[PDB]
Amino acid sequence: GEEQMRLPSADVYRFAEPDSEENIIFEENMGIPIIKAGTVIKLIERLTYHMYADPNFVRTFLTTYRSFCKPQELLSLIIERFEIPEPEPTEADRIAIENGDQPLSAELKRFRKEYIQPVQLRVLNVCRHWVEHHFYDFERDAYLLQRMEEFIGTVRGKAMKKWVESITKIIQRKKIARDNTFQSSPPTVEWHISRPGHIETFDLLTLHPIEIARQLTLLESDLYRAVQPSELVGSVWTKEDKEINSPNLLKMIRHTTNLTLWFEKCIVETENLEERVAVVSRIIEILQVFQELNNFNGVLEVVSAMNSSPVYRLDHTFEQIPSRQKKILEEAHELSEDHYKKYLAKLRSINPPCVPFFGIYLTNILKTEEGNPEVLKRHGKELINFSKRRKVAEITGEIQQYQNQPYCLRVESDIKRFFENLNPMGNSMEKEFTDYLFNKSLEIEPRNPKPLPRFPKKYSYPLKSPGVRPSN
Ligand SMILES: COc1cc2nc(C)nc(N[C@H](C)c3ccccc3)c2cc1OC
């Protein structure tokens, strides 16, 4: 047809081949069509489509492309997309040109205005979005940035120079940011037995339970806000380049692991029954203050430690926990039942700030990664399943909704360092450390036929909690 013949030939340009069932497919539409799957060449063509802007596809593609295309490869493909060949002059214009006259160039001017200029501006819009929302690709790869800067720095014409200046302004702002707010005063920092600065005495029962929950919420809020969506795409936190591709996500997971295991260690290593009741009761009070602060991540870290194999079996310890605290713990656990039905209602109704439970996002993303194929086959050809990536991107979009909710709480540097440097395992691996905790659990409360032994006290300081009500 006429529309296809005016486009460049396949022997001079790869992004102009006709659409077909074996190179691009779409979801049901009733409006910009939604791409279900396509080859990388068709995804690049639609990423920089001449007929209309597509901000949803650009956003989803730049968040998830690392699962099917390398950053260097994507830059080469969008640069290749930008370099469009122009049609040859018509016979009449060829005669005008050889006589030294100005050609009419009717179709040539139309191709430049309706195809070349829109595609080139779309390529530049992709570059701008890439540097604005995913500058980490350029921080990790200095050669990728040198290539980008050379490309934008050699684009000609005043119409595109304004776009180039906007891209450069972002790149420079990002480089400057690598180098170098409250309405009310935050509440008073709470202290119990440990005095400010006496970091040697810092522990679960010597620090104030209110301040443990506040500082852990500040720590977890910062860790939550730092996770970038691409760190969660294609299960990259479970593959070889995990440390480079998912640094903030792995830091969130390791804090959750270390805090949960630290709570369990505090419990099972407290061999005296009465002292262990005080330890468990103090962790429940920490959960209460996490609930007050809408730190659902912290509430469910306490629930995980209490449900763990070594702690959950301590019938004699929970027997002495007051009914009110046991009820608080049971309702916190019921937040997780029925696929987190009650947690989702609580999260939707609460007033910010909050720290959402991060584990549910990992669970849902892994379900989507394992449950959907990487590619779709149509007529014996493989197409990248883009709808799978879009489903993951929508879960990461929910994460981003709660990443702009700072707390009006004062940081206590020593308490912050104490929780950032938790190392319950020491030199042990996780599996061997959990086997240790379970054997310690069997020692302090042996299985039913065997009687319950007495153990000596380990804490010199008083065990009475100062409560969860502030002081002033
Ligand atoms: C069927 O399994 C369970 C059901 C559970 N129901 C409730 C209501 N609370 C659980 N734990 C919470 C944190 C708890 C409360 C009081 C004392 C100790 C622990 C459960 C744990 C389970 O397994 C580990």
Coordinates of C-alpha atoms and ligand atoms in Angstrom, one line a residue:
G1 CA 0.0 0.0 0.0
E2 CA 0.9 3.7 -0.3
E3 CA 1.4 4.1 3.5
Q4 CA 4.1 1.3 3.5
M5 CA 5.9 2.5 0.3
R6 CA 6.5 6.0 1.7
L7 CA 8.3 4.5 4.8
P8 CA 12.0 3.5 4.4
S9 CA 13.0 0.1 3.0
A10 CA 14.1 -2.9 5.3
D11 CA 17.6 -2.9 3.6
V12 CA 18.3 0.6 4.9
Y13 CA 16.2 0.8 8.2
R14 CA 15.0 -1.9 10.7
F15 CA 12.1 0.0 12.5
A16 CA 9.7 0.3 9.4
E17 CA 8.8 -3.3 8.7
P18 CA 5.0 -4.0 8.6
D19 CA 3.2 -5.0 11.7
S20 CA 2.1 -8.7 11.9
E21 CA 0.8 -11.4 14.3
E22 CA 4.4 -12.8 14.5
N23 CA 6.2 -9.6 15.6
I24 CA 3.7 -7.5 17.7
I25 CA 0.4 -8.3 19.5
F26 CA -2.0 -6.1 21.6
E27 CA -4.4 -6.4 24.5
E28 CA -8.2 -6.0 24.0
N29 CA -8.9 -2.2 23.4
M30 CA -12.2 -0.2 23.6
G31 CA -7.5 5.2 23.0
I32 CA -3.8 4.2 22.7
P33 CA -3.6 0.4 22.3
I34 CA -1.8 -1.6 25.0
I35 CA 1.0 -3.8 23.8
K36 CA 0.9 -7.4 25.0
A37 CA 4.0 -8.6 23.4
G38 CA 6.5 -8.0 20.6
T39 CA 10.1 -8.4 19.3
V40 CA 12.6 -5.9 20.8
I41 CA 12.6 -4.0 17.4
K42 CA 8.8 -3.6 17.5
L43 CA 9.0 -2.5 21.1
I44 CA 11.6 0.2 20.2
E45 CA 9.5 1.3 17.2
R46 CA 6.4 1.7 19.4
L47 CA 8.5 3.2 22.2
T48 CA 9.2 6.0 19.7
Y49 CA 6.0 5.9 17.6
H50 CA 5.5 8.8 15.3
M51 CA 1.6 9.0 15.5
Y52 CA 1.3 9.8 19.2
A53 CA 3.0 10.2 22.5
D54 CA 2.6 7.1 24.8
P55 CA 3.7 8.1 28.4
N56 CA 2.4 4.8 30.0
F57 CA 4.5 2.6 27.6
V58 CA 7.6 4.8 28.0
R59 CA 7.3 4.6 31.8
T60 CA 6.7 0.9 31.9
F61 CA 9.4 0.1 29.3
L62 CA 12.1 2.2 31.1
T63 CA 11.3 0.5 34.5
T64 CA 11.3 -3.0 33.1
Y65 CA 13.5 -3.2 29.9
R66 CA 16.5 -4.6 31.8
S67 CA 14.7 -8.0 32.0
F68 CA 15.0 -8.4 28.1
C69 CA 17.6 -5.8 26.9
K70 CA 20.9 -4.4 28.2
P71 CA 21.2 -0.7 28.9
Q72 CA 24.0 -0.4 26.2
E73 CA 21.9 -2.4 23.7
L74 CA 18.9 -0.1 24.3
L75 CA 21.0 3.1 23.7
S76 CA 22.3 1.6 20.4
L77 CA 18.8 0.7 19.3
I78 CA 17.3 4.2 20.1
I79 CA 20.3 5.9 18.3
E80 CA 19.7 3.5 15.3
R81 CA 16.0 4.5 15.5
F82 CA 16.9 8.2 15.3
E83 CA 19.0 7.8 12.1
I84 CA 16.2 7.7 9.5
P85 CA 17.1 7.7 5.8
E86 CA 15.3 10.1 3.5
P87 CA 13.6 9.1 0.3
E88 CA 15.2 9.8 -3.1
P89 CA 14.0 12.9 -5.1
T90 CA 11.2 12.3 -7.7
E91 CA 12.1 12.3 -11.4
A92 CA 10.9 15.9 -11.9
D93 CA 12.9 17.1 -8.8
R94 CA 16.0 15.2 -10.1
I95 CA 15.8 17.3 -13.3
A96 CA 15.3 20.5 -11.3
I97 CA 18.3 19.6 -9.0
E98 CA 20.6 19.0 -12.1
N99 CA 19.5 22.3 -13.7
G100 CA 20.6 23.9 -10.3
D101 CA 17.1 24.9 -9.3
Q102 CA 15.3 24.3 -6.0
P103 CA 13.3 21.0 -6.0
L104 CA 9.6 21.0 -4.9
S105 CA 10.3 18.0 -2.5
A106 CA 6.6 17.6 -1.7
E107 CA 6.8 14.0 -0.3
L108 CA 10.3 14.5 1.1
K109 CA 9.1 17.6 3.2
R110 CA 6.0 15.6 4.3
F111 CA 8.1 12.6 5.3
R112 CA 10.4 14.9 7.4
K113 CA 7.5 16.7 9.1
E114 CA 5.2 13.7 9.7
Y115 CA 7.7 10.8 10.4
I116 CA 11.4 11.9 10.9
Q117 CA 10.8 14.9 13.2
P118 CA 8.2 13.1 15.4
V119 CA 10.4 9.8 15.7
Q120 CA 13.5 11.9 16.5
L121 CA 11.6 13.9 19.2
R122 CA 10.3 10.6 20.6
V123 CA 13.9 9.3 20.9
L124 CA 14.9 12.5 22.7
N125 CA 11.8 12.2 25.0
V126 CA 13.0 8.6 25.8
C127 CA 16.5 9.9 26.6
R128 CA 15.0 12.6 28.9
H129 CA 12.9 10.1 30.8
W130 CA 15.8 7.6 31.0
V131 CA 18.1 10.2 32.7
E132 CA 15.3 11.7 34.9
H133 CA 13.9 8.4 36.4
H134 CA 16.7 5.9 35.9
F135 CA 20.0 7.8 36.2
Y136 CA 21.4 4.8 38.1
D137 CA 22.1 3.1 34.8
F138 CA 24.5 6.0 33.9
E139 CA 26.0 5.9 37.5
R140 CA 26.7 2.2 37.1
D141 CA 28.1 2.6 33.5
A142 CA 30.2 5.7 32.9
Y143 CA 30.7 4.5 29.2
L144 CA 26.9 4.5 28.7
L145 CA 26.7 8.2 29.9
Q146 CA 29.7 9.1 27.6
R147 CA 27.8 7.6 24.7
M148 CA 24.5 9.4 25.6
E149 CA 26.3 12.7 26.0
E150 CA 28.0 12.3 22.6
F151 CA 24.7 11.4 21.0
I152 CA 22.6 14.3 22.4
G153 CA 25.6 16.7 22.0
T154 CA 25.8 16.1 18.3
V155 CA 22.1 16.4 17.4
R156 CA 21.6 19.4 15.0
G157 CA 18.9 22.0 14.7
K158 CA 17.3 24.6 17.0
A159 CA 14.0 22.7 17.2
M160 CA 15.8 19.7 18.9
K161 CA 18.5 21.9 20.7
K162 CA 15.9 22.9 23.3
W163 CA 15.2 19.2 24.0
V164 CA 19.0 18.5 24.2
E165 CA 19.4 21.4 26.7
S166 CA 16.6 19.9 28.9
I167 CA 18.3 16.5 28.9
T168 CA 21.7 18.0 29.7
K169 CA 20.2 20.1 32.6
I170 CA 18.9 16.8 34.2
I171 CA 22.2 14.9 33.7
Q172 CA 24.2 17.8 35.3
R173 CA 21.7 18.1 38.2
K174 CA 22.0 14.3 38.8
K175 CA 25.8 14.5 38.8
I176 CA 25.7 17.4 41.3
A177 CA 23.2 15.4 43.5
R178 CA 25.7 12.4 43.8
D179 CA 28.2 14.8 45.4
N180 CA 26.0 17.3 47.5
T181 CA 10.9 20.3 56.3
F182 CA 8.9 19.5 59.6
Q183 CA 5.9 21.7 60.5
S184 CA 6.2 20.8 64.3
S185 CA 9.1 20.0 66.6
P186 CA 9.5 16.1 66.9
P187 CA 8.7 14.5 70.2
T188 CA 11.3 14.2 73.0
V189 CA 13.8 11.3 72.5
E190 CA 12.9 8.6 75.1
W191 CA 15.5 6.9 77.3
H192 CA 15.1 4.1 79.9
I193 CA 18.3 2.4 81.5
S194 CA 20.9 3.2 78.9
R195 CA 22.1 6.8 79.0
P196 CA 22.7 8.9 75.9
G197 CA 26.2 8.1 74.5
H198 CA 26.6 4.9 76.6
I199 CA 26.4 2.7 73.5
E200 CA 28.1 -0.2 75.4
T201 CA 24.9 -0.8 77.5
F202 CA 22.5 -0.5 74.4
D203 CA 20.2 -3.6 74.2
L204 CA 16.5 -4.6 73.8
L205 CA 15.6 -4.1 77.5
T206 CA 18.0 -1.1 78.3
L207 CA 16.8 1.2 75.5
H208 CA 13.3 2.7 75.7
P209 CA 10.8 0.6 73.8
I210 CA 9.2 3.8 72.3
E211 CA 12.6 4.9 71.0
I212 CA 13.4 1.4 69.6
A213 CA 10.2 1.6 67.5
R214 CA 10.7 5.2 66.5
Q215 CA 14.4 4.7 65.3
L216 CA 13.5 1.4 63.6
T217 CA 10.6 3.2 61.8
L218 CA 13.0 6.0 60.7
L219 CA 15.5 3.4 59.5
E220 CA 12.9 1.2 57.7
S221 CA 11.2 4.3 56.2
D222 CA 14.5 5.4 54.7
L223 CA 15.2 1.8 53.4
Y224 CA 11.6 1.6 51.9
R225 CA 11.9 5.0 50.2
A226 CA 15.3 4.0 48.6
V227 CA 14.0 0.9 46.7
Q228 CA 13.8 1.7 42.9
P229 CA 11.2 -0.3 40.9
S230 CA 13.8 -1.9 38.5
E231 CA 15.5 -3.6 41.5
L232 CA 12.3 -5.7 41.7
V233 CA 11.9 -6.6 38.0
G234 CA 12.9 -10.0 36.5
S235 CA 13.9 -11.3 40.0
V236 CA 17.3 -9.6 39.6
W237 CA 17.8 -9.6 43.4
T238 CA 18.0 -13.4 43.2
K239 CA 20.5 -13.5 40.2
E240 CA 24.3 -13.0 39.8
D241 CA 24.5 -9.1 39.5
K242 CA 22.2 -8.7 42.5
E243 CA 24.6 -6.4 44.4
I244 CA 24.7 -3.9 41.6
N245 CA 21.1 -4.1 40.2
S246 CA 19.3 -4.3 43.6
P247 CA 21.4 -2.6 46.3
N248 CA 18.6 -0.9 48.1
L249 CA 16.2 -3.9 47.9
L250 CA 18.9 -6.3 49.3
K251 CA 19.5 -3.8 52.1
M252 CA 15.8 -3.8 53.0
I253 CA 15.6 -7.6 53.0
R254 CA 18.8 -8.0 55.1
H255 CA 17.6 -5.5 57.7
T256 CA 14.3 -7.5 57.9
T257 CA 16.2 -10.7 58.3
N258 CA 18.7 -9.4 60.9
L259 CA 16.0 -7.6 63.0
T260 CA 13.6 -10.7 62.9
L261 CA 16.5 -13.0 63.9
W262 CA 17.8 -10.6 66.5
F263 CA 14.3 -10.6 68.2
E264 CA 14.4 -14.4 68.2
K265 CA 18.0 -14.4 69.6
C266 CA 16.9 -12.0 72.4
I267 CA 14.1 -14.5 73.3
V268 CA 15.7 -18.0 73.1
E269 CA 19.0 -16.9 74.6
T270 CA 17.1 -15.6 77.6
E271 CA 17.1 -19.0 79.4
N272 CA 15.4 -17.9 82.7
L273 CA 11.6 -18.2 82.1
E274 CA 10.6 -14.9 83.9
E275 CA 13.3 -12.9 82.1
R276 CA 12.2 -14.4 78.7
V277 CA 8.5 -13.3 79.5
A278 CA 9.9 -9.7 80.0
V279 CA 11.8 -10.0 76.7
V280 CA 8.7 -11.2 74.7
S281 CA 6.4 -8.7 76.5
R282 CA 8.9 -5.8 75.5
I283 CA 8.9 -6.9 71.8
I284 CA 5.0 -6.8 71.9
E285 CA 5.2 -3.2 73.3
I286 CA 7.6 -2.4 70.4
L287 CA 4.9 -3.8 68.0
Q288 CA 2.3 -1.5 69.8
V289 CA 4.4 1.6 69.1
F290 CA 5.0 0.4 65.5
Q291 CA 1.2 0.2 65.2
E292 CA 0.9 3.8 66.5
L293 CA 3.4 4.9 63.9
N294 CA 1.7 2.9 61.0
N295 CA 4.9 0.9 60.6
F296 CA 3.3 -2.2 59.2
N297 CA 6.7 -3.5 58.1
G298 CA 7.8 -3.4 61.8
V299 CA 4.5 -4.9 63.0
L300 CA 5.0 -7.9 60.7
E301 CA 8.7 -8.3 61.5
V302 CA 7.6 -8.8 65.2
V303 CA 4.8 -11.2 64.0
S304 CA 7.4 -13.2 61.9
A305 CA 9.8 -13.5 65.0
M306 CA 6.9 -14.7 67.2
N307 CA 5.7 -17.2 64.6
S308 CA 9.2 -18.5 64.0
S309 CA 9.9 -22.2 64.8
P310 CA 12.0 -21.4 68.0
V311 CA 9.7 -18.8 69.5
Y312 CA 6.1 -20.0 68.6
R313 CA 6.7 -23.3 70.5
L314 CA 7.4 -21.6 73.8
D315 CA 4.1 -22.4 75.5
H316 CA 5.4 -21.6 79.0
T317 CA 6.5 -18.1 78.0
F318 CA 3.3 -17.1 76.2
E319 CA 1.3 -18.6 79.1
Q320 CA 2.6 -15.7 81.3
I321 CA 2.0 -13.0 78.6
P322 CA -1.0 -10.8 79.7
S323 CA -4.2 -11.4 77.8
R324 CA -4.1 -7.7 76.4
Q325 CA -0.7 -8.2 74.8
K326 CA -1.6 -11.7 73.5
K327 CA -4.7 -10.1 71.9
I328 CA -2.6 -7.4 70.3
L329 CA -0.3 -10.1 68.9
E330 CA -3.2 -12.2 67.6
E331 CA -4.8 -9.3 65.7
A332 CA -1.4 -8.3 64.2
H333 CA -1.1 -11.9 62.9
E334 CA -4.7 -11.8 61.5
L335 CA -3.5 -8.8 59.3
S336 CA -1.7 -11.6 57.2
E337 CA -4.6 -14.1 57.0
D338 CA -6.7 -14.5 53.8
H339 CA -3.8 -13.2 51.6
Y340 CA -3.4 -10.0 53.8
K341 CA -7.1 -9.0 53.5
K342 CA -7.1 -7.0 56.8
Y343 CA -3.7 -5.5 56.2
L344 CA -4.8 -4.1 52.8
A345 CA -7.9 -2.5 54.5
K346 CA -5.8 -1.0 57.3
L347 CA -3.2 0.4 54.7
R348 CA -6.0 2.0 52.6
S349 CA -7.7 3.7 55.6
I350 CA -4.7 5.0 57.6
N351 CA -3.5 8.6 57.5
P352 CA 0.2 9.1 56.5
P353 CA 3.0 8.7 57.3
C354 CA 3.3 4.9 57.1
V355 CA 5.9 2.2 56.4
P356 CA 4.0 -0.5 54.3
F357 CA 4.8 -4.2 54.7
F358 CA 7.4 -4.8 52.1
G359 CA 7.3 -8.6 52.0
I360 CA 3.9 -8.8 50.4
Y361 CA 5.2 -6.9 47.3
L362 CA 8.1 -9.5 47.0
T363 CA 5.6 -12.4 47.3
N364 CA 3.3 -10.9 44.6
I365 CA 6.1 -10.0 42.2
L366 CA 7.7 -13.6 42.6
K367 CA 4.2 -15.1 41.9
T368 CA 3.9 -13.0 38.7
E369 CA 7.5 -13.9 37.6
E370 CA 7.1 -17.6 38.0
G371 CA 3.4 -17.7 36.9
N372 CA 3.9 -16.0 33.5
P373 CA 6.2 -16.8 30.6
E374 CA 9.2 -14.6 29.5
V375 CA 8.1 -14.9 25.9
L376 CA 4.9 -15.6 23.8
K377 CA 5.1 -17.8 20.6
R378 CA 3.1 -16.7 17.6
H379 CA 3.7 -18.6 14.3
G380 CA 6.9 -20.2 15.6
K381 CA 8.5 -16.8 16.5
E382 CA 9.4 -15.6 20.0
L383 CA 7.9 -12.3 21.3
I384 CA 8.9 -10.7 24.6
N385 CA 5.9 -10.9 26.9
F386 CA 5.6 -7.2 27.8
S387 CA 2.3 -7.6 29.7
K388 CA 4.2 -9.8 32.2
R389 CA 6.6 -6.8 32.8
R390 CA 3.7 -4.4 33.0
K391 CA 2.1 -6.5 35.7
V392 CA 5.3 -6.3 37.8
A393 CA 5.6 -2.6 37.1
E394 CA 2.1 -2.0 38.5
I395 CA 3.1 -3.7 41.8
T396 CA 6.2 -1.5 42.0
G397 CA 3.9 1.5 41.3
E398 CA 2.0 0.7 44.5
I399 CA 5.3 0.7 46.4
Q400 CA 6.1 4.2 45.0
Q401 CA 2.8 5.6 46.4
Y402 CA 4.1 5.4 50.0
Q403 CA 7.7 6.6 49.3
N404 CA 7.0 10.3 50.0
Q405 CA 5.9 10.0 53.7
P406 CA 8.6 11.3 56.1
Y407 CA 8.1 11.1 59.9
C408 CA 8.3 13.9 62.3
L409 CA 10.8 12.0 64.6
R410 CA 14.3 13.0 65.6
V411 CA 17.1 10.7 64.6
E412 CA 19.3 9.5 67.5
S413 CA 22.6 8.6 65.7
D414 CA 23.8 6.1 68.3
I415 CA 20.5 4.1 68.4
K416 CA 20.4 4.3 64.5
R417 CA 23.9 2.8 64.2
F418 CA 23.0 0.1 66.8
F419 CA 20.1 -1.0 64.6
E420 CA 22.0 -0.6 61.2
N421 CA 24.9 -2.8 62.6
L422 CA 22.7 -5.7 64.0
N423 CA 24.5 -9.0 63.4
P424 CA 22.7 -11.7 65.3
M425 CA 24.2 -14.5 63.1
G426 CA 27.8 -13.3 63.7
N427 CA 30.0 -15.5 61.5
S428 CA 27.2 -18.2 61.1
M429 CA 25.1 -18.7 58.0
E430 CA 21.3 -18.3 58.2
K431 CA 20.3 -22.0 58.1
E432 CA 22.9 -23.0 60.8
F433 CA 21.9 -19.9 62.9
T434 CA 18.1 -20.9 62.7
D435 CA 19.1 -24.5 63.6
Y436 CA 21.0 -23.0 66.6
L437 CA 17.9 -20.9 67.7
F438 CA 15.7 -24.0 67.5
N439 CA 18.0 -26.2 69.6
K440 CA 18.3 -23.3 72.1
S441 CA 14.4 -23.2 72.2
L442 CA 14.3 -27.0 72.9
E443 CA 16.9 -26.6 75.7
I444 CA 15.0 -23.7 77.6
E445 CA 11.6 -25.4 77.1
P446 CA 12.0 -29.1 76.4
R447 CA 9.3 -31.1 74.5
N448 CA 6.3 -32.2 76.7
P449 CA 7.4 -35.6 78.1
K450 CA 10.6 -34.0 79.5
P451 CA 10.0 -31.7 82.5
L452 CA 10.8 -28.0 82.5
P453 CA 14.2 -27.1 84.1
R454 CA 15.0 -23.8 85.9
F455 CA 17.7 -21.5 84.6
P456 CA 19.7 -18.7 86.3
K457 CA 19.1 -15.0 85.6
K458 CA 21.3 -13.1 83.2
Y459 CA 20.0 -9.4 83.6
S460 CA 21.4 -7.3 86.5
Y461 CA 19.2 -4.3 85.7
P462 CA 15.4 -4.1 86.5
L463 CA 13.1 -5.9 84.0
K464 CA 10.0 -3.6 84.5
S465 CA 9.1 -1.8 81.2
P466 CA 8.7 2.0 81.3
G467 CA 5.5 1.5 79.2
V468 CA 4.6 2.8 75.7
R469 CA 3.1 6.2 76.9
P470 CA 5.5 9.2 76.2
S471 CA 7.0 11.5 78.9
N472 CA 6.9 15.3 79.3
Ligands
LIG1 C1 -2.2 -21.7 62.3 O1 -1.0 -21.1 62.6 C2 -1.0 -20.0 63.3 C3 -2.1 -19.3 63.7 C4 -2.0 -18.1 64.5 N1 -3.1 -17.4 64.8 C5 -3.0 -16.3 65.5 C6 -4.2 -15.6 65.9 N2 -1.8 -15.8 65.9 C7 -0.7 -16.4 65.6 N3 0.5 -15.8 66.0 C8 0.6 -14.6 66.8 C9 1.8 -13.8 66.2 C10 0.8 -15.0 68.2 C11 -0.2 -14.6 69.2 C12 0.0 -14.9 70.5 C13 1.0 -15.7 70.9 C14 2.0 -16.1 70.0 C15 1.9 -15.7 68.7 C16 -0.7 -17.6 64.8 C17 0.4 -18.3 64.4 C18 0.3 -19.5 63.7 O2 1.4 -20.2 63.2 C19 2.7 -19.8 63.5

